[PDB]
């Protein structure tokens, strides 16, 4: 087909939702900071529920996003832990997917006893060239119907590139 209709990785974002503030959040920030190499961003709580023990405007989560080759290698490491196997329902109608792991030392980070163990969430966004049309400030417009990704295409792309299995 046309050279301008090839899929690629837009960005990869990973977040850790600890659920409380304090030393645990700070150590949950250090693991992301070390892994990505960038400064992460704290996220507060919009609601207030006493069942979860959270109130409004107190930090309970940390996340960060990466783009380019760095995203590709980190996505590779997570799929390695998942041994390149994913469920069909992990793919959305817009053409994205994600998964999660229960332990951050599995990638191999030279375990430190003074920082505990955390799990994290993986989510990556697919795209095509020419997506600037809906993101630029001037003459912002809407991407055409034939130029957007579907569930069948993105699962097929995953099987060809990573040689994984989805059922």
């Amino acid at each position: 087909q046309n050279p301008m209709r090839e899929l690629r990785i837009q960005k990869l974002v990973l977040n850790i939702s600890v659920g409380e503030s304090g030393d645990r959040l700070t150590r949950a920030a250090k693991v992301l900071e070390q892994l990505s190499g960038q400064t992460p961003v704290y996220s507060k709580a919009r609601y207030t529920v006493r069942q979860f023990g959270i109130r409004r405007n107190e930090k309970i989560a940390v996340h960060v996003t990466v783009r380019g080759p760095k995203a590709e290698e980190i996505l590779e490491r997570g799929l390695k832990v998942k041994e390149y196997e994913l469920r069909r329902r992990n793919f959305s109608e817009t053409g994205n997917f994600g998964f999660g792991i229960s332990e951050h030392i599995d990638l191999g980070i030279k375990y430190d006893p003074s920082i505990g163990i955390y799990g994290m969430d993986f989510y990556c966004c697919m795209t095509r060239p020419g997506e600037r049309v809906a993101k630029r400030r001037r003459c912002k417009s809407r991407i055409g119907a034939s130029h957007r990704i579907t569930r069948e295409e993105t699962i097929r792309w995953f099987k060809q590139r990573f040689d994984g299995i989805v059922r």
């Binding site: 400030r137 001037r138 003459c139 912002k140 417009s141």
Partner: protein, 300 residues
């Protein structure tokens, strides 16, 4: 299930916005404050200097506003700098300064005030404003215009203020402050007056050339392919622009001709009307429906 939001009742109550806001081209909040004038001054016009950028060109105009539309007083594009010795970097800071100066001279000549109000004539990185000139033991106030930047961001070092700096040196009066020019230090609130001089003559491009050629030769020749084919080096750009400056203030109405196909206005109209498709008629549209029924009915 869930409610369908975009149903017929949604469409019936929908109110569209102004057409050029749907196209995302004009900011009507700012436009009102730009063009409106005091009723004390009855029909005195307000002159706007609009500047727009494309991928490969710079657009500049001097505009007034009327009830049924705007009126263009002068224009000066960047591709017209070809007939002055400039052929590369047509959308950089130095080209913006040159195309601004061209319009200022082109406007003053049309008004008849070119002999007075010369300008600076020695582009220097200082902050000055055009003053009133004395003639026949009397003073005359300079021509006045205001900048219209559109949807661009007004950060320190943008090219919109490059066009303004050129027009200001051309002889027009344009009110401004200097805290937005390249080489302004916000910490001490001082202007270097030499970094601005470098940017006027395109010195930031030249230093990129010599640095890039020393540390990455492959990238240097892949990004400056057309620059080296004409034997343009980092030591010639300054004299190249200074030559264009004095040529511009000698014949601002020099004509430029491109290499695109050339025809006449009537010839072009005949050419275009051939690649035009006409709407169907009522009889044709009804006959298509009748044919479609036969197809579907016989498809079973």
């Amino acid at each position: 299930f869930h409610k369908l939001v975009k149903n017929s009742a949604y469409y019936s109550r929908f109110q569209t916005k102004f057409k050029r806001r749907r196209q995302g081209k004009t900011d009507y909040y700012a436009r009102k404050r730009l063009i409106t004038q005091a009723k004390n001054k009855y029909n005195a016009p307000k002159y706007r200097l609009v500047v727009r950028f494309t991928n490969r060109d710079i657009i500049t105009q001097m505009v007034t506003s009327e009830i049924n539309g705007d009126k263009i007083f002068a224009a000066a594009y960047s591709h017209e700098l070809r007939a002055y010795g400039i052929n590369h970097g047509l959308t950089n800071w130095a080209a913006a300064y040159a195309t601004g100066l061209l319009l200022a001279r082109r406007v003053l000549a049309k008004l008849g005030l070119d002999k007075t109000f010369t300008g600076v004539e020695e582009p220097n990185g200082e902050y000055t404003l055009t003053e009133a000139a004395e003639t026949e033991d009397g003073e005359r106030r300079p021509f006045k215009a205001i900048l219209d930047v559109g949807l661009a961001r007004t950060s320190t070092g943008a090219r919109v203020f490059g066009v303004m700096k050129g027009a200001s040196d051309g002889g027009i009066f344009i009110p401004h402050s200097e805290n937005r020019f390249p080489g302004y230090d916000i910490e001490t609130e001082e202007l270097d007056t030499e970094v601005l001089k470098k940017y006027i003559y395109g010195g930031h491009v030249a230093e990129y050339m010599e640095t890039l050629a020393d540390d990455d030769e492959e990238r240097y020749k892949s990004q400056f392919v057309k620059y080296i084919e004409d034997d343009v080096e980092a030591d010639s750009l300054e004299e190249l622009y200074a030559e264009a400056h004095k040529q511009i203030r000698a014949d601002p109405f020099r004509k430029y001709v491109s290499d695109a196909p050339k025809k006449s206005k009537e010839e072009w109209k005949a050419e275009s009307l051939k690649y035009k498709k006409a709407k169907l008629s009522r009889e044709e549209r009804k006959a298509r429906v009748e044919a479609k029924i036969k197809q579907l009915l016989a498809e079973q």
